[PDB]
């Protein structure tokens, strides 16, 4: 028993992290087979950062400028290109510890594990969600650029995040592994603002089911309709619940024998009347960074 915010085991991704250096600019890259992926702003000096001409700055670079270290071992770059906001550096050695992997662009409200890296060396691992406003609430210091977010889908590492930047409000922004930004954000040191954030309703419902699986029942009660629930949901800045949301909370509903709409009634009361000095799974707020499958992985002891 017990419930923790649990990250995936990171060992598969740790063997892929390398240090990329251009002149004095240093960040992290992901060594998969004979390619090293990394954010393109590794080619910037501190004074290039306002609005860099990436196309021009790259033409000026040669393979010998890109110094790539995997631990103590040096990797010869033999080719260079740019796809959106990533560099792909062809190197002369395939990573022998390349795991089975794919690149996925994940949806807002999906979770993943962040391996925070500095100087090509993993330092820490934590669980994150793509917020509805396309930002993550991370812990990243200068040099964390190129750190990756990932899921394990059965036997396959799903890479879904490379870290680029910190926004003024202290929230984090980055790309999929094909160098495209989550949200409306650009790799410039400019005054960029996040949009209006929202609670991930389906996740909160998935967490209440975890609380019931773990023998916590105190918030069950009344039965509401879908449309009455959503009138309340959006006053409290929760995402409207769709019929597909209700569908994917089906396994949890079946396993607990609590109808999704009965759990919506539970949530509606908690939103209105508060938790009144109560806790659920060690928390005195409603947690929205557990997806349905996250609750199943921890509660059923899925291994990899």
């Amino acid at each position: 028993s017990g419930f923790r915010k649990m990250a995936f085991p990171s060992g598969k991704v740790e063997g892929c992290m390398v240090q990329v250096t251009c002149g004095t600019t240093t960040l992290n890259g992901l060594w998969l087979d004979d390619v090293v992926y990394c954010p393109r702003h590794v080619i910037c000096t501190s004074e290039d950062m306002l609005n860099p001409n990436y196309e021009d700055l790259l033409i000026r670079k040669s393979n010998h400028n890109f110094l790539v270290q995997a631990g103590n071992v040096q990797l010869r770059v033999i080719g260079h290109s740019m796809q959106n906001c990533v560099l792909k550096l062809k190197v002369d050695t395939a990573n022998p510890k390349t795991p089975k992997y794919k690149f996925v662009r994940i949806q807002p409200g999906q979770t993943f594990s962040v391996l925070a890296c500095y100087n090509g060396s993993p330092s820490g691992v934590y669980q994150c969600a793509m917020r509805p406003n396309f930002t993550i609430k991370g812990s990243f210091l200068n040099g964390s650029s190129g750190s990756v977010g990932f899921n394990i889908d059965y036997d396959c590492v799903s890479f879904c995040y490379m870290h680029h930047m910190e926004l003024p409000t202290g929230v984090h922004a980055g790309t999929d592994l094909e160098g495209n930004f989550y949200g409306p954000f650009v790799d410039r040191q400019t005054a960029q603002a996040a949009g209006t954030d929202t609670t991930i309703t389906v996740n909160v419902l998935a967490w209440l089911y975890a609380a019931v699986i773990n023998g916590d029942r105190w918030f069950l009660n009344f039965t509401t309709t879908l449309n009455d629930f959503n009138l309340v949901a959006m006053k409290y800045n929760y995402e409207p619940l769709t019929q597909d949301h209700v569908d994917i909370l089906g396994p949890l509903s079946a396993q607990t024998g609590i109808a999704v709409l009965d759990m919506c009634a539970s949530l509606k009361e908690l939103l209105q009347n508060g938790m009144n000095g109560r806790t659920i799974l060690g928390s005195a707020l409603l947690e929205d960074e557990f997806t349905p499958f996250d609750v199943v992985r921890q509660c059923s002891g899925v291994t990899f």
């Binding site: 004095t24 600019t25 240093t26 960040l27 954010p39 702003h41 590794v42 910037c44 501190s46 950062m49 500095y118 100087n119 990243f140 210091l141 200068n142 040099g143 964390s144 650029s145 870290h163 680029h164 930047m165 910190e166 926004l167 003024p168 922004a173 954000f185 790799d187 410039r188 040191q189 400019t190 005054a191 960029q192």
Partner: peptide
């Protein structure tokens, strides 16, 4: 106030 691209030097 300004976005930080989180390279090290």
């Amino acid at each position: 106030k300004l976005a930080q691209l989180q390279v090290a030097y």
